[PDB]
Design a protein around this ligand. Sequence first.
Ligand SMILES: Cc1cn([C@H]2C[C@H](O)[C@@H](COP(=O)(O)OP(=O)(O)OP(=O)(O)O)O2)c(=O)[nH]c1=O
Ligand SMILES: Cc1cn([C@H]2C[C@H](O)[C@@H](COP(=O)(O)OP(=O)(O)OP(=O)(O)O)O2)c(=O)[nH]c1=O
Lengths: 401, 401
Amino acid sequence: LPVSCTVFVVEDTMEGENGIEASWRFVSHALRYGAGVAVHLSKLRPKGAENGKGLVASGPVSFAKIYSTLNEILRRGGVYKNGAVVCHLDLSHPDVLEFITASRSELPWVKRCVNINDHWWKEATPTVKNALLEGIKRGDIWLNKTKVDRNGNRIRGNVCLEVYLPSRGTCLLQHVNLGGCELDEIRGAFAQGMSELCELHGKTNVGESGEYLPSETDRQVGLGMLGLANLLRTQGVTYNDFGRALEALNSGRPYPSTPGYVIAQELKAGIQAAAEIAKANKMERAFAIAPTASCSYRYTDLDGYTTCPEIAPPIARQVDRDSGTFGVQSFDYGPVEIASEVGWESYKRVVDGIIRLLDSTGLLHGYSFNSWSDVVTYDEQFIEDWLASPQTSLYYSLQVM
Amino acid sequence: LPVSCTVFVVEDTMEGENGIEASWRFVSHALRYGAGVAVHLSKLRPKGAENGKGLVASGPVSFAKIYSTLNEILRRGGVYKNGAVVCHLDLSHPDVLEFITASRSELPWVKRCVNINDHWWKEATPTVKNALLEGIKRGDIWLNKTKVDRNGNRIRGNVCLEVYLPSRGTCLLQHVNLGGCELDEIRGAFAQGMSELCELHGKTNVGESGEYLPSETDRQVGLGMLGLANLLRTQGVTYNDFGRALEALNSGRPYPSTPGYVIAQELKAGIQAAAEIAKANKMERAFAIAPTASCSYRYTDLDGYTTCPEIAPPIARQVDRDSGTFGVQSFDYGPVEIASEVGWESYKRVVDGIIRLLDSTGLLHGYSFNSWSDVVTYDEQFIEDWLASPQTSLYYSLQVM
Ligand SMILES: Cc1cn([C@H]2C[C@H](O)[C@@H](COP(=O)(O)OP(=O)(O)OP(=O)(O)O)O2)c(=O)[nH]c1=O
Ligand SMILES: Cc1cn([C@H]2C[C@H](O)[C@@H](COP(=O)(O)OP(=O)(O)OP(=O)(O)O)O2)c(=O)[nH]c1=O
């Protein structure tokens, strides 16, 4: 199916409609088509908890092994080999420590994400914090925040962390190419994208298979953006200037009409237009920023160069992608600013400003924030700053220098 | 349930009534109650077989890992911890070699049995034979023969190898205590046991759960025997004399009326009476010899000593059984002959004679033959002799001296 991702929550019982065995069947079905899953194990009771009629429960870390085996077998046998599994878990779970410290031999083919917020982080003991920092520094444990819908009932993130869905949901995404649109066309492009997304929401028919929710009950769609670096290059605006202009616009402070200010105002106007169009069709959540590693390569800017993925600056001007089918393809991002030159502060400020702009309308799913391992030093201060900032995830740990 | 064992055969398809996923659910259900399973993987296509719509199949050895994980988790969490899994496989399967050589790290918590006969053994290449001999010498691979019902449709052995059942079947067993019955009472005891088994066959209601076959369609029961060594001791008959008498009786040759001959004639008469009673109730198969390690300890002979398990001679006169609940219990088998003193030949001849007597009526399931590793040298000649002899399995590799 076109469904890129799906979300499943497993109840604390072996059998049922959403039982662990039903979880095995659903994961097998999702992997046989290539779509990834995010099996949330936050409800399984802790390991060693005795009920009285002796059933010494094993805990989520035990079933992680079953999911790992299923993933390995089916992905190596599956038609689509791009599927992945992400076994989310909470930070308040008493088992989290074990979940953090399991070596790659025990759980070889499953990524791991931790749902954290202010309360659980504060309550966590120092040992758990140190284990989390060590894990993230080695690139094993991802982070994600917790957000409740307007009714207060919990919603859960997907595989790639920027879309928030309920149980057995699905994800519909569409990307707007900033590099390929002129400054005046931004609002029109945003309106066209949002209208197309609203129209396409009701014609997917994903839920007909009986595994997914019906389309009428979802009321969600994600309008992401890609190709910011090319736009900044074309207008001759550096990341520092764009970040300062975005911060000034968001704070409401007066600012001179520099090109960065014009771009920021155009982005705000387009976001507002898209928000109005979505509100017309009764869309709960509209804006979601997802990585475009597999989608950016098929688009081009005005000058003919390849558009940079999402809004971050490309690590290197030229990228050589190796695929077993089409071989090795060497593409160029043009004379754009790259990670080492811009610096950590400019990138962080720019992403924070854009995420604040998108969130201002209240229709934000999330963002798949990266992290440059060769520049910043992982510390509890870094996690505190990440939690304080409007970001909503921590995806990968790259090397830039 | 009282069901000691069950048999499942998995088809070559992911979904269905007997699909691999149905196999996972059935194995989980069987393990949650302690009853073991014998998941026959002889129908899964070989690893690496391509169909054209790319599905590079993994093979049975891959799903052995899923079954191992399920067994580990559920047995350590299961209420009854006596459950076990035995992943049968054929000798003609092109994957058998891998199945034989997998180390204990890959498949830690699943036993392995090989279904062999004359044709497959002859067709097997030397490397497979050497791998099988090495495996059996280390006590990893068990053997079992192939037998077809009166209609020619294949039937499959259970976990402990002496009962032959169809898919989703069950096993009903009852044991006759030779040590606790006088020489004249043998026929009456056999008749009583067979009548009780026939009566109890139709009142188990195992198939009401929807997983097992209905009781009306089974038409099977197993009348085993235990406590031969005590009987031989009481009558003052050594294993050699009893074996010679049994061989003479079976061959039809004239023989003097020695005590061994009297015992053999009584056994034959009792077997014939039980066979007639079973045939009265239309029983397809009636006689099955199973190990009594967990059942012999609750019975006593005429002199008050504990009866020896099945028909083999006990390894040591005194046995100290350690259980976490009742602690350590030291029981005595009395002044009975033991393994080293009797020798391999006498034991082999006695078991062969008794199995021939039981098979003479055509109502034999099988026998769980042991093997003394410290006496016999494993060679292709040994396997040839085992195949030639009326035995039907090869269970464990013990040490006697
Ligand atoms: C039976 C069993 C349960 N468990 C644990 C893990 C599951 O999350 C949890 C679900 O057990 P349940 O299936 O709900 O056990 P139960 O219904 O018989 O008893 P109760 O209602 O009190 O739970 O039990 C094991 O880990 N291993 C086992 O073998
Ligand atoms: C899809 C898939 C199949 N297989 C192998 C193992 C199973 O024994 C076997 C069953 O596949 P099927 O489910 O029968 O595949 P199919 O129905 O789409 O195509 P066909 O009818 O030709 O089989 O395929 C894998 O090993 N891994 C996989 O991911």
